[PDB]
């Protein structure tokens, strides 16, 4: 293990990882990034109708 500042076997990510439970994926909107997109769109909507 060549890791220096992190424990071995550990790979850090900047995004929450939720392992998939099925092998036949379908569209889903309960996502970390989907929430971000929805919030941004809603903020823009609140801006335009101010």
């Amino acid at each position: 293990s060549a890791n220096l500042f992190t424990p071995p076997e550990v790979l850090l990510l900047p995004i929450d990882h939720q392992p998939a439970n099925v092998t036949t994926p379908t569209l889903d909107f309960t996502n970390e990034l989907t929430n971000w997109r929805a919030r941004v769109c809603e903020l823009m909507k609140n801006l335009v109708d101010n």
């Binding site: 439970n21 099925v22 036949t24 379908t26 569209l27 889903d28 909107f29």
Partner: protein, 50 residues
Amino acid sequence: FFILALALPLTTDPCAPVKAFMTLANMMVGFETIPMDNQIYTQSRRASAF
């Protein structure tokens, strides 16, 4: 959706009403959500799969 809604009740398929409902359910994803049975036959499956 209109075409399918009018066409479905004339077929002999016993499982027709479920497909009629799921046809709208598919179009309505993200906009409006409902609880489904499991992770496989989620709200975003092709209506014809049921």
